[PDB]
Amino acid sequence: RWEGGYERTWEILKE
Amino acid sequence: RNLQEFLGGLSPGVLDRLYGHPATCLAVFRELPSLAKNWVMRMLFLEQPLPQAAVALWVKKEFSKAQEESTGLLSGLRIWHTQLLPGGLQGLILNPIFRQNLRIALLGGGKAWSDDTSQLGPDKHARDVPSLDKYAEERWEVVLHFMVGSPSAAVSQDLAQLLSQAGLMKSTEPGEPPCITSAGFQFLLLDTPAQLWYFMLQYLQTAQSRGMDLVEILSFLFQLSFSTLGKDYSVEGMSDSLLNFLQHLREFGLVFQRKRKSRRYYPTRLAINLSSGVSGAGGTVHQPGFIVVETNYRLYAYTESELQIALIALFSEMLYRFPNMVVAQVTRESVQQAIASGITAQQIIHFLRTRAHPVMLKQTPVLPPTITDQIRLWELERDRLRFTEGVLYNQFLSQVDFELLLAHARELGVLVFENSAKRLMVVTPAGHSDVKRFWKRQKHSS
Amino acid sequence: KVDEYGAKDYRLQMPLKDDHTSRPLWVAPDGHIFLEAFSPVYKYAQDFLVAIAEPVCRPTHVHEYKLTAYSLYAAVSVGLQTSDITEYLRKLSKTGVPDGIMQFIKLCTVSYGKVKLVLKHNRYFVESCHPDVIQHLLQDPVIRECRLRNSEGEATETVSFEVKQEMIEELQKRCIHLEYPLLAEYDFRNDSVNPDINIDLKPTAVLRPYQEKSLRKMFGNGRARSGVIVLPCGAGKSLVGVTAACTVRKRCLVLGNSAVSVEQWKAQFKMWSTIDDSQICRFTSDAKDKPIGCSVAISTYSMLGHTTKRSWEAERVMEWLKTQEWGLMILDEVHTIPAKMFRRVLTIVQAHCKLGLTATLVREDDKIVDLNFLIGPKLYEANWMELQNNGYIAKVQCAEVWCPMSPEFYREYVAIKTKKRILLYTMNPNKFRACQFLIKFHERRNDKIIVFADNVFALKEYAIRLNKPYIYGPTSQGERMQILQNFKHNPKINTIFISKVGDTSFDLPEANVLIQISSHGGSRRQEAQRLGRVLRAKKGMVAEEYNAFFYSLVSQDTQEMAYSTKRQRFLVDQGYSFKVITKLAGMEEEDLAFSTKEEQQQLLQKVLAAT
Amino acid sequence: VNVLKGVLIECDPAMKQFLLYLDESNALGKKFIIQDIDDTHVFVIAELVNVLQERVGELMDQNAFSL
Amino acid sequence: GTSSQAEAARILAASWPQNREDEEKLFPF
Amino acid sequence: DELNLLVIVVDANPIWWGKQALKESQFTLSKCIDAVMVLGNSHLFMNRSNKLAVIASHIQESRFLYDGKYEL
């Protein structure tokens, strides 16, 4: 049921 | 052609005059083979001629080939010479002038080549070693920019005349800038040390044109080679011919001088290694590679100067131009066009390997072998057909006559191709006349 | 503006900022994007570009992506707004983003998902929250004709309106012209007409990271959305479709290219789903099953594309399918869809969620733009080289082998000018010798050898002279599977010659050596797909970068060369390289056929006999 | 007597057969390939040889693709 | 025949890209 | 890349050289030092990569010794 919702937006963060 | 090749082709008097300068002796000795260096050091204090057989007995029998190679190289350079030893024998002895100058250079004594810069004290407008190297790079880039034809590089007209004498650019239409020839194209892809070495070789071959002493110029070049980077030297004490030659070198950036009246001058690492030509400088820390070669025949350039842009566009179709990056594609069309311009594939491959980006250096082969092989295949496909103008001899009714005529033509060295099975052959237009005359004369004798 | 060298001078419109090495992206105002793989931010930029941009070229170091209205629509329907996209772009772009690209993105994103298409009660409604848009669209004559007419011919009246079933694709194309693309969103959880099905995922099912990523991107906020997902053959693409069907759990219809595809789909559904076999049926002409109670119906396009009268039972099953409304529809080999007969199938069938899976999406007839609204936006496309690195698929060793032409053969080839030249170069004695040497070498290496030959006659002659099994047009299915099992199980026979039917007409056992002799003549996607399907992941040589061997025989100085460079271009887009092998080492010592030219001239006799 | 001074061409057998076809079929028009010489060499007038290579230039052009 | 085999080998050695490489002068084989 | 290093160790015993000096022979310590220096100069002459190391061996300790002539 991992298909409910997922985004790698938080992976995209300035470092 | 290395430096020793040009030295081996000069007259004995020029060699003798050059030997008067200790720096020239040091350069010649350092450029010798190891066995030659050992022999010269052995003969350094030998005031008597050495029997040739005695000298030959010193080396290994197996190394006799290299021994004779060094012997002939030394004889051609006229470091030593043969002397009529009493009893008909032929001894060997170094040049007394050259030997004495070498001793002065090594043992000491004599007079210094030039006075120290401390006479003028510290330089008011002194520069830094990185500044000097950057200035030399800027000067050479400006020279190449003029070679391109861009209006940015406004250089001396005498420089253009020198290039024309070198044949790089032919001024077919006066007033308009000359068009760079095929040899100029090949030179354009040479590495910067190779470019400088070729230019200096041409200058030396045309040294007498400006009425400049070749011996003096070579001695000054050697002195620059053995100079120290980051240190200036006294301009004074040199002939006006050498002064103008130094002006030319400054125009090339090989030596820095703030003003034409300045009595100091800073040689550059390019000038230091200029004597060595192409080899010798095994530790050349070149500029970082900014060319990325992808498997899809795409080149990406991390550059901003028009010079590298022109170099890349010589053999690839430009696609995009970003401020810090240029996207181009290598095609069969562009490579074939460049080859038609005279550039060889090896030059393109070596150039790309030279300006290879560090990322691609991680690959065990520097560049994708597919692309290199494709460039080689394009080069071959350009030259698939073989053309040769000649005359056909095909009326041979006798095999013996055909064999005799073929042997005579091979004696003349004018044969193009032979076919004994069909008794057919082709000859050069030049060699056609002699073979025809011989055939007619043998018919007459029959 | 263009430079004298021809490159586009975009420097003026690109304000470069000092964060050069840190930021990996170049955004040219043409709409193209460039990324550097060596950058430390590669993964983040990779995912961002995949989400927003459609990949074009992915060689080792520098990749090129493109921006399209469909790509922007996909990004919006994923759930990303304009501000976030702009911010992330400017954070990754080496130079400033040109205002033209900004304006293009604004214009595209401002109207995405505005118009909604609903399939309820076997009726298609168009609705939206902006009635001015709908009312203004009524002026379009195409929209007038597409709108359902009353029994008297009058037009039917967030209020929606029914649209003619036949005029869906017409509306699909028209809406793009109306700059208001429709939304293919399904009520995944709000469904009430179609109940769920006793089908789940077996514990043996494993989702590799790219598969799960693609599935979750499809399931935008938990609602299934129509689209196309591109995966290499054997990468679990069928498993991915099965997983999607299990997730939807609604009524499922699957369409395959051929009967073998239907059989494989049924086997995969059994292998990973919990659906009882009573609810699985194959709507084929050979194995007939009752459509009633069939939760997942598997068929082919031809079985639905039969314009001619079908069998009586087939008519009843088609009536049952037309009456039933499908929560999910699955289409395989999407590249064949743009054909007119197969496109009519989409109009024929009424389904909510349509998902397409394939290995390639470059139809040589450039009929792909319409497919962007025939099904939807391209959902995902895994990086082939990346999958090679992860070892999910074999790391292929590609090679192109040039074969010299015999002087008589070449003279004949030059003499002919029409399409009849195919036979001569496909029957090059040197090409035959090269193929024989390769087969001998790989058999001595104990390799799985599959040799393709599109030409019927050439395949027959090659296989017969080499005395190896051959499969072509007749392809008796029982004997076909007999030959396949002989190759799979018998170690004595490991050299199978296959005609054009090897593309999609049957199942290819996993192999390691694939030798392609003759191709269609420019089908850059067909033979690339054939290469992808033939060579699969094999254990033992995963560490090595060359565990699968592909050879493409091309005759020198023929037009075939022009085809090969034209074709493998697609594989170049995936970073695959082809090293030219003019000469094969070892052919001298080993005795091969046609050593004498006197044999070769007899072969020429045979070839010219067939014109 | 009758002995000709022209330009000989040396190529691989494929190009040899291509030149044979050019001469026989009169694709170049006038039979300027008067006579070959050897198993890989031919003898042509220098008047047409340039244009002859032109045809060869097209040939290897047509066995290639444009990017 | 031996003569035929020799002639075939010779003409094959006259292949276009091979002869150039020979005059100027990975995979498991 | 061929870097040749020729480390030279000199027997600098004052007693033996004093004995030799009293003998008033042709050879003294000065000639030995000159010969060593000339040999080292020649070694540096033979190649740029060559390096020279000179250490004098004396009873008290071992000493690390290192106009028309070469600057270096």
The residue segments making up the domain with residue D25 are 1-67
In sequence order, the β-bridge partners of residue B169 are B180
Which residue, B70, B82, B76, B79, is CA-closest to B98? B79
Angstrom distance (rounded) from CA D19 to CA D13: 10
C451 close to C499: Cβ distance less than 8 angstroms = no
C415 contact residues in D (CB cutoff 8 A):
21, 25
**What Rg value do the Cα atoms of chain B yield, rounded?**
28
Q: Identify the burial level of D1 via C-beta atoms within 10 angstroms of its C-beta, where 0-12 means exposed, 13-18 middle and 19 or more buried.
A: exposed
Give the CB-side neighbour count of residue F17, counting CA atoms within 13 A: 13
What is the rounded CA–CA span in Å between residue C218 and residue D28? 62
Burial class of A13 by CB neighbour count within 10 A (0 to 12, 13 to 18, 19+): exposed
Phi, psi of C367 (to 5 degrees): -95, 50
Which chain C residues contact residue E15 at CB under 8 A? 404, 556, 582-583
The span from the CA of C236 to the CA of C435, in Å, is: 32
Chain A's closest residue to C211, CA to CA, is: A3
Please provide the distance, in angstroms rounded to a whole number, between the alpha carbons at the two ends of chain F: 21
What is the C-alpha to C-alpha distance for residues B419 and D51, in angstroms, rounded to an integer?
A: 28
Quote the minimal CA–CA distance from D37 to chain B in Å: 8
Method by which this entry was solved: cryo-EM
DSSP strand E in C375-439: where?
Answer: 378-381, 396-403
Strand partners, C115: C182
Strand-pairing partners, residue F53, are F7
R_g of chain F computed on alpha carbons: 15
Coil vs helix vs strand at C299 = strand
Q: Which amino acid belongs to residue C174?
A: R
Establish if F68 touches chain B: CB-CB under 8 angstroms: yes
SS3 call for C381: strand
Q: In chain D, how long is the greatest CA-to-CA distance? A: 53
For the record, the structure tokens of C350 come out as 């009424």
- Residues sharing a CB contact under 8 Å with residue C425, sequence separation 6 or more, in sequence order: C405, C409, C413, C431, C555, C558, C559, C560
Which residues are CB-neighbours of C467 under 8 A, at least 6 positions away? none
Distance of CA B110 to the CA centre of its chain: 34
CA-angle at C340, arms to C336 and C345, nearest 5°: 80
Number of domains in chain D: 1
Cα distance between residue B25 and residue D14, in whole Å: 60
With 0-12 / 13-18 / 19 or more C-beta atoms within 10 angstroms meaning exposed / middle / buried, residue B93 is middle
Phi first, then psi, for residue C543 (nearest 5°) are -60, -40
Q: What is the dihedral of CA C406, C412, C417, C423, to 10 degrees?
A: -70
DSSP C95: B
Q: Which residues, including other chains, have CB under 8 Å from residue C184's CB and lie 6 or more apart?
A: C117, C225, C226, C227, C353, C354, C376
Is the Cβ–Cβ distance between B262 and B235 less than 8 Å? yes
Tell whether the torsion through CA atoms of B47, B52, B57 and B58 is positive or negative.
Answer: positive
Breaks (C-N over 2.5 A) in chain C follow: 157
> How wide is the angle at C-alpha B349 spanned by C-alphas B345 and B353, nearest 5°?
170
CB atoms within 10 A of CB B409: 23
HEC profile of C575-598? CCCCEEECCCCCCCCCCCCCCCHH
The stretches of C118-180 forming alpha helices (DSSP H) are: 131-137, 141-146, 168-177
Q: How many residues does chain E have?
A: 29
Distance, in Å, from the CA atom of C512 to the CA atom of C535, rounded to the nearest integer, reads: 6
Amino acid identity, position C598: E
Report the C-alpha gap between C272 and B15 in whole angstroms: 91
Q: Among partner residues C404, C414, C557, which is closest to D21 by beta-carbon distance?
A: C414
Total beta-carbon pairs less than 8 A apart between chain B and chain E: 4
- Residue B213 corresponds to which tokens in the numbers above? 């002493």
Rounded CA separation B24/B235 (Å):
19
Chain C residues with CB-CB distance to D60 below 8 A? 557
Contacts of B416 (CB under 8 A, 6+ apart): B388, B390, B425, B426, B427, B428, D8
Cα separation of F43 and F45, whole Å?
5
- Cβ burial, residue B256 (10 Å; 0-12/13-18/19+): buried
CA gap B208, B217 in Å, rounded:
11
- Distance, in Å, from the CA atom of B375 to the CA atom of B347, rounded to the nearest integer, reads 11
B108/C465 Cα distance (integer angstroms): 87
C554 phi and psi angles, rounded to 5 deg? -130, 135
Answer whether C119's CB lies under 8 Å from C185's CB: no
**What are B6's two structure tokens?**
């040009």
Within 10 Å of residue C105's Cβ, how many Cβ atoms?
Answer: 21
Q: How far apart are CA C130 and CA C158, in angstroms?
A: 7
Contacts of C319 (CB under 8 A, 6+ apart): none
CA angle C480, C484, C487 (to 5 degrees): 140
Eight-state DSSP code of residue C550? E
Tokens standing for B88?
């008909």
SS3 D53: helix
Question: For chain C, which residues lie within 8 Å of any Cβ of chain A, measuring from their own Cβ?
Answer: 44, 47-48, 78-80, 84, 88, 91, 207, 212-213, 215-216, 219-222, 247
Task: Return the half-sphere exposure (C-beta side, CA atoms, 13 A cut-off) of residue B333.
Answer: 8
Give the annotated binding-site residues of C for ATP. 231-238, 533, 536
Q: How far lies C109's CA from each of C29, C129, C222, in Å? A: 17, 16, 21
Rounded to an integer, what is the distance from CA C552 to the centroid of its chain?
21
Beta bridge partners of B180: B169
How far apart are alpha carbons B332 and C64 in whole angstroms? 22
B87 — phi, psi (to 5°)? Answer: 90, 10
Angle at alpha carbon of residue B260, lines to B257 and B261, rounded to 5°: 105
